[PDB]
Amino acid sequence: LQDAEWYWGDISREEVNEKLRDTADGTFLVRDDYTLTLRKGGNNKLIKIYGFSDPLTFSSVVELINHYRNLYPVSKYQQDQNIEAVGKKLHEYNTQFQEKSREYDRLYEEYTRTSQEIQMKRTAIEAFNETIKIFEEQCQTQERYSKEYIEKFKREGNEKEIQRIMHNYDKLKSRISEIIDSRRRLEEDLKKQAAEYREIDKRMNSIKPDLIQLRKTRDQYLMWLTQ
Amino acid sequence: PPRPSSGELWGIHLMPPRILVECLLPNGMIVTLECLREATLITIKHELFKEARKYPLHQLLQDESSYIFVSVTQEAEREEFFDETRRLCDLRLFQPFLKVIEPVGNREEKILNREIGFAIGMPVCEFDMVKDPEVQDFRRNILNVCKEAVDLRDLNSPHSRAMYVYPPNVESSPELPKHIYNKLDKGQIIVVIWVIVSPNNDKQKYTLKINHDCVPEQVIAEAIRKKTRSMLLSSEQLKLCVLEYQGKYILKVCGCDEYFLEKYPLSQYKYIRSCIMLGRMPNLMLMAKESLYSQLPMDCFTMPSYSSTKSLWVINSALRIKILCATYVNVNIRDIDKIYVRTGIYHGGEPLCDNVNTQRVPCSNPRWNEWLNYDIYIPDLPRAARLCLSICSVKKEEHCPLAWGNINLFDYTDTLVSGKMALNLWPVPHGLEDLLNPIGVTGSNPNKETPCLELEFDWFSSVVKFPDMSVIEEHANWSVSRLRENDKEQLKAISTRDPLSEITEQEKDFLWSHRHYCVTIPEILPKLLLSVKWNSRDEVAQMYCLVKDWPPIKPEQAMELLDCNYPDPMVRGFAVRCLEKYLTDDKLSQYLIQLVQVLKYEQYLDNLLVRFLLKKALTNQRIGHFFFWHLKSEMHNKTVSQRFGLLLESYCRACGMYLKHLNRQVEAMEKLINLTDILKQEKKDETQKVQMKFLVEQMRRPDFMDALQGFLSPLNPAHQLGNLRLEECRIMSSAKRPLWLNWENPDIMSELLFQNNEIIFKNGDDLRQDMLTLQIIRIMENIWQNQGLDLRMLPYGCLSIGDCVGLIEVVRNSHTIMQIQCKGGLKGALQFNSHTLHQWLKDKNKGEIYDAAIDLFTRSCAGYCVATFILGIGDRHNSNIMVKDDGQLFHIDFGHFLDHKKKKFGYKRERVPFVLTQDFLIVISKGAQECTKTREFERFQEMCYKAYLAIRQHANLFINLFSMMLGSGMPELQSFDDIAYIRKTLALDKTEQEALEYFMKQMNDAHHGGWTTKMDWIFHT
Ligand SMILES: C[C@H](Nc1ccc2c(c1)OCCn1cc(N3C(=O)OC[C@H]3C(F)F)nc1-2)C(N)=O
């Protein structure tokens, strides 16, 4: 009864909730007075104890379960992969795990960094767009005003002042072209980095399950040495 | 959007001393003007229009003052720069250029909008361009709260305005514990009044001796009596003269901006009670009401430019939702096989039925186009019901999430939504291995670059709405019409159990059965609510009826019902109503950090909690201050930006003149962030003598001096910060090399409080843990003090003001244990004396005082031993522990004591060993080396015993304060699992007598490890 497999000593609830995570409604284990944890609707129900309510039909706890049995349990033992070779693989599976662990963190260091830089670029582009809009309105302001002046100076012989107006105009538009060029070189940097992000993601999603199952198997190799 | 730089120009921290700016003129010319980095816009506009005559069309340029500069900021905003006092460096420009234009619209309105924008760290125009009707509703409807608050404030002017500003800084009860009362002479206190007489500030002082419970008006009366002494008035003339004038004056704390404007016993004011317990002599300054009331602005509240249903219970079908398709997902087709959409309907983090997946589909193309059928009925949906879904990889057979998203099944109009829904999804947190994330933010990622899953909700030929209350009340009588002597004993014994205690499914039925008896033990309510089945409409509708007519409970208890386990709007409104009616501003201020956090759990923007806090913030400017900062600190955060921004907007639009003061604080904080950002990135390699030189050089400049002088301390806005003492400013030798800053206290009478105001600014670390730990420590002390256990703690100020940026309050006349030993001249010994500390105290508190200092050390030492144990602060050393000259010990630098908590590679749980160092025991025992058996030590152990039991006895409150923080963001408070430890330390599963012996063991186990040689102090050899 103490030996029987579904009994998990006197453990904390964090440990229990961990194992009942992600199971089908039915799975169970008993723990310490005796209580029984169980799945129903995808929740961890708690049920005290021999019997539950009034008619205490049973003689021991190991019987009580087996009547309601008429639920596939969590096993203290069942650790499907000599003490010498298992002591070795703990150094091997734990190194294989810990090498991936540090590769994941460095992937996250990129992930985060790269995420922020993208958002920055997106702001910068919004800025350039508004900047450029303002210069384009300055262009239309120059036409409105230089219209009446360029015609006057053209009517006079004075094309010295025509040359002075259009020195300003050429600078303005040359400046616009430079700003548009800067927005464009950022648009390519943004698209390049967005793909670099999408890629860094694909690598993390591919190394995420690898990290989980390396912990599952490694944890059960420790459970064999302590039993 | 909000900017990540505090640089003066995009991607550049500091502007070169001079730079070229392109100035676009209103006649369409473009000139390039070399400018000083620090030049004002007026000196820039003057110089421009001068040089603009060299260029063509100079004839079209009207008067210089007819025009306004425009540029594009680092928030990609067209800012119109109305305030031309501002400097080029402070303009937060994207690109160095300006446009000269004719000013357009309503000048007043536009200026205020800028001020609101700057304050909240986000331009107001971004809110205008948001379509979600919930958003635009919130913005309009919340002004009801603003109008109410502003009315209260200008109701009984000008006293009411002076009340909003300068609210009385008051303890929650007027009563004094005996240890405080015994401290009084004879129930009396000696007080020093002050008056400013001559234009050049000549000071007279009146020394009154009054009863502690005199209200300020009576203090003033006794002051009048002392001055009218010897003026040949009769009893009648005098009594008439006091009555007439006692209320033409107000008292103020000399040294800071605290006032005694309300009829509370003087003892109840925190400044006084502090003086009482410190043995200091209150120095109040008397002045006429007009002197204050005239200085109050009398602000004005502009109203902004923004101004066939079937019930749910008549739709008897099963719930079903259709997963159409996603846009993409970032998975490698090599390695990973197939992907599916997991779903679930949830009540908080409690699922209401079984979780339902879709069929597998290959990575490369995600299209499902299938209805998922859910195992509950549409009438059986609780009001706070939510779909929580994600997308999962499949590779034994190893499942993992990819993107996730949650949805409220009813909108904010109670409308069970139908039709098509796009839902841009979120990335998974760091360590989340769970398929679903129901705790995560509810709603759609405003990042439209993310994977986007389309959904279809079932249509029912009309608008579906959640039932009225009348409908729900009826159904309660339809639901019902269908004990023992140890029972009442049993459900008394489960209200005394803590929230984190686990309730059996039997005890749930027990509770539900006896739900009518429970109304007589109304503090059971939280437990009963967990016994309810929320998927059963029948139970819910009955519970709605109980709650509606439930007895109010202590606000400390109502709080529990605002954490994550209580999503139901009816349960929450109850809590808010308990808080509305029974929560003092003292306690609101003390618990404000949790109350701000649990706004994030609210489903909808407009709600009862928000409206409660917003009102108190707009009613009490002390609360408003920390309201603003607690919110501002998180505006960087993707998740909450829009909510908090919206809330900040409503605050900033009605808070009054304080908006101006808050800008000054913000601007100051920005310069500090920028300055220190340089020292962290571009000059991290450079030596600490070179950094000091650079620091000095930058702080000297006039743009920085203007910014960082003459503003209010964010740690405590009663405190003014005057001129900087740059000689006393310095880079500290600690983690993240924080700035140590020093300001003159510009108070006329600063010498009577403190003449220098010292703050640590620390850029780099997350300070939320320190904030929370200090809050706890304060509350612990408040409990102790109120029960008449005189244990003195020191919860110094700490405030996060951004993403890993905050302030720490310096305490004066204090030193780390290390610093104290080095002072005593080590002599190069590998082991420290161990009497050094006691020696230092003797030297500091000679003869007369001595016993008082030992007392204080003993009492403080006791408080921190208990606090440190219960909370499991293992990581104490001789640079975490500090002692004041008067003997008061306290702990600093939290935020690292949870780093080694999680197990690894099976190394067993890191025990938090309760030990006390021998040096401290020696001090307690006044120099005796047999310090484990003195009267001093027993008396000390007893202190600890009582303290421990007092916190245990209030365990529920601490559990709830932590519980409210779980959805905050702190990586170290993630789940009820993280708090569990406290149950062990307080021994909540044992008896009280068993807990005392547990603590007694733990404490006696410590000093078995005495005379531990400690053979080297630097390296621990
Ligand atoms: C003269 C100087 N005085 C002082 C220094 C630090 C703190 C303090 C007073 O009291 C306020 C509490 N405090 C808290 C911290 N710190 C902390 O909490 O984390 C790191 C460290 C500081 F570097 F920020 N430092 C102090 C001293 N003894 O060397």
Ligand SMILES: Cc1c([C@@H](NC(=O)Nc2cnc(N)nc2)C(F)(F)F)oc2c(F)cc(F)cc12
């Ligand atoms: C979480 C958390 C705690 C819990 N304390 C411990 O778990 N201590 C402990 C135990 N074992 C080891 N090895 N190290 C530390 C508890 F106080 F709630 F118990 O206190 C906190 C606190 F004051 C502030 C904060 F922001 C978070 C927390």
